[model samples]
Target chain A: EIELTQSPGTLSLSPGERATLSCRASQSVSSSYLAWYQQKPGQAPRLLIYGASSRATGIPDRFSGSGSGTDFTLTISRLEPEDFAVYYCQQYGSSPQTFGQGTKVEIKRTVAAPSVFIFPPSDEQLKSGTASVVCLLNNFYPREAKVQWKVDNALQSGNSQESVTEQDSKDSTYSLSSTLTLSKADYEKHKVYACEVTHQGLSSPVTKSFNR
Target chain B: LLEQSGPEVKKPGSSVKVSCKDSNEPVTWVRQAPGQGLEWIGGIIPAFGVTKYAQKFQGRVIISADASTATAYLELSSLRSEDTAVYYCAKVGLRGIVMVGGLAMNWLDPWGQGTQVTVSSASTKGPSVFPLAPSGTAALGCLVKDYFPEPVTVSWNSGALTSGVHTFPAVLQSSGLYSLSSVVTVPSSSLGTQTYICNVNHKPSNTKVDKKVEP
Candidate 1:
């Protein structure tokens, strides 16, 4: 009879760094009857903590739980190489128990950051209406980037697009293509369109601009 | 199933007594009178006449055990008209740890129907009933409130009300009158094809207040 939401969608941290994951419930769970789990690819999830703040058997002291009622936190003081997997939070003993959106912990590498490119809509696309722009993110690792459109450095919404992430077998890096379509009339008077890509690997986001 | 037997009245001898069975654990009594919060009387261990007493009722109210019949009687002596109230018997059980000055781990379960005492007095009032407007869902409900006394009858209309009956027990409001919630729902087959209504039968008021589901 409750729903849970886990935040940060993705957690990219290197080994030896601490990780804090959060889960919020839509309603209260009795006696703080919540549980957290960690899962590796091709394996079932293993229980990390149970009975709210109590650790399960064989769980390291590094993994601890706190908070009660609607808010709960799972803290891993230091990440081991094996701990770099997807973690989930679950509320048990309800009519229909709820599981959280798994937060994936990726190895944050200092290299192989994505490259950015912009492609404005063609002449034929402009006449037909809903003319758009395409932003391509190439050669990125750990598959996620925040892409936003700016008109002459001013931010705007109503941009729709992104493609599935593909990885390079040789380098083990990921790549994605995002296309944002805009109204032709809306962009008719705009002098410039900027596409910015913020990747976890970099300290600063890369931007590619197109001038009409 | 714990049961409290028959009501007792103020007697010529200035005493009132009630019989109860199967406490299984600690026996506790809660008293409810007009214009006051629920008062908890002391509890007793059924194994012996051994007991503890609340400061207010020190020697005036007490319970004695009859081992042969497995019966218990709570007898209170010398009560004035002001002492009239409903006395409920509760069996307190299932405590893993009994704490001192800490949150309670104990609970009261299988409460008795209660022994009602009368020194004098009363009121008779009709129930106010209203049908709630239909929402996005198929189910409709009516509200009943401000009624005096217990045992209000519910007359429902529908092919089949969901969950057998959609009536709740009487809840005493601040006005000292009782309130109830009656939801009317029909089986999906006739859910859209039919209408719903609820009628509450107030015995003392001789009034049947009802309302049809608003479209």
Candidate 2:
């Protein structure tokens, strides 16, 4: 049996920077059976290097690997835009194969507070009884944001649909949308609905309110 | 995710096309050679007849599709021995897909069974078995190697040794084939004249190799 251990659990860097990662094996591994992989957040692990130091087909030269026996190193000559993610090393050189736990590469980011807006039904539609309120979160950076809805200061569920996240291909920022259903009772009561957006970029939750 | 099919091997320097069928638009192709891991080939927006390939595969393979048939095609020209592998076609951006690098990361789940391509000489090899019984342990080791178009499954079956049978993952050989060994251990007191069997299943070749040992 063979085991692989990785170091520097997390690596924080910026684009164009060079980063070196390391993997150590419990026993000697044949050069021909070593491989490296890059796993982007929310994506499958992509093969980076195989056969110890050879790059996988189509992988850019920016990623390189070396070392033999029990010690190995994977070096990124220059990080690309999409190079921020976790990396793993695997050895197929022995029976009961094994893989390194993982090493993460994070990109430092500047905070971009989300812009929040709420769409509520018109007075006429509210008077007609049933309505819907939609919340939109735009221009958020780092893309890790969550939305929650409240009816008259009370948390509500089932009436809200799941949020949809979209990334703007142009600016690389993120946007999200969510909707909540409104009943006649709430509309008649003039109940207020609030959408709250939370993210690491903001010190406090951003709230958008609407009333019938 | 898309459903891939076909490898339809042809002679070297000839052309062969594989298919991936599903309702998902914009299908991508990934290939895995016998002992090697997966490689991204390229993708196509079938609706627009637009296609893209990895720099390494550009001009070597053509990707196309017919929206009407809900099928995507991968055509390889001037086939070479290196082209032999399992081809998988996939649909990007399925619901619940991960978002990576600010873009929705796509994967191949519910992918097709895979198309097998053999560009050169091919052969199926069996396994060799050995028996061992230590002071407190007894085992049967079966070794299989030199097989192509991988993804081999190994299992152990024995009526005499019913409870503690464990199989390990197959090991990939440098030659692009595979080597695997399955072991079954019985009690030292119960290790007399018992039958233990090792089974190796290779799907692409539709072959199963079984070896039995009696102690």
Candidate 3:
């Protein structure tokens, strides 16, 4: 089986900047069976360049591929805002096809803490004999945030938790929402429920509390 | 989640348009052949009418959307025998790839019940079910193999199980047949009885087979 390697392990640049990615094979390929793919968070890797230099259908002209034999390259004339994601180079000319280690193209700027807020259980939720508390986080970057939930400052367990994070269409920032559900008896017995966010982009953690 | 609508079989040179029903979020097309790994065919943003595709499918595939219908479409022309596979439409997930350098490969969300596509007709082969010898751990497993057409159903204890059962996809074998396996976590209450059984329904021949294993 042939092996592939990607260069620039990480490419950091701003929008409109020219971005170039590289892929090298351990040995020369018989033909152009190499391919490149781009992947965003929570998404599957989409094929970009295949047969060495052939651009995929619907791909923009700004994106181009060119290479032969052992060396290959994918270039974006002007990087788009959504182009910041991990890329892969793969070789299929041999058995048990292989892929590159993956090259991440991220934004160069550093991000800070998110805006953390918590929404207390509403009276309707209280009337239902079950309380649903929500923790909302906004304005974060790198899309790498960890969530934790606690009741009365103790880590909560066995409670169904559903968390969602998405990017804003207009602002390009990140937002997260997490919900904690508990029975009325537990809600009234506890002092508060806290939602904690641990993000690598931040120097510290962001925690928000919802009191009874 | 999503639902897919398309024809199950098609003739070569004929086109197929598979539609995904969802509102507003961009949808991606992921393909899994009878015995191959997942392939990301491409995606389309309904609201923006923007589309993207993998180079292998570049010219043969078209991705489109209609915001009015709140649906996305994947059209593949000049279908060939190698095009046989199950296609899933999905919403991209928010969980990033979890690897070194923050590089992670996290996939798809709210996916559709995969749509099966067969580019040509093939002979049907029924499956043979057998109980895996209980070993290593406390888990019970069932093996169903030597089948064709890729779709099959395997149930434990004739559907008495409501949870803790894991069924894997069919795998293509070197002999040109397909194989699949399923397992279930044993409860602490289990130590005896012929209660552990696997019921397999092979789609190609519409046959059912049952294999029992002791705990």
Distance from true location, Cα of B161 in model 3, Å: 46
Work out the TM-score per prediction: 0.34, 0.42, 0.45
Better candidate by TM-score, 1 or 3? 3
What DockQ would candidate 1 receive versus the native complex?
Answer: 0.01
Error of 1 at A195 (Å): 46
lDDT of 1 by residue, A13-60 (tens): 877999999989999876776778776643334668876687777889
Residue A195 lDDT (model 3): 88
Root-mean-square deviation per candidate:
22.7, 28.3, 20.1
Top-lDDT structure, candidate number: 3
In candidate 3, which residue ranges exceed 4 Å CA deviation? Answer: A1-12, A22-29, A37-47, A54-62, A66-72, A82-92, A95-112, A126-129, A157-164, A199-204, B1-37, B40-215
* Candidate 1 lDDT, B11-84, residue by residue in tens: 33377888777644667676656423245566666765566555678779887767677666788777775677
Per-residue alpha-carbon lDDT of model 3 for A1-212, expressed as tens digits?
56777898878777789999998888886477676777665344576776667776776888788888889898989988878888888665554345677787766545756666566665544675756565555556767788889888898765634433334444455555555667788788988789888988667887777566
Could you give the interface RMSD of each candidate, to one decimal? Answer: 23.0, 27.0, 18.8
Structure candidate 1, residue pairs in collision: none
For each predicted model, how many residue pairs clash, with residues at least 3 apart or on different chains?
0, 1, 4
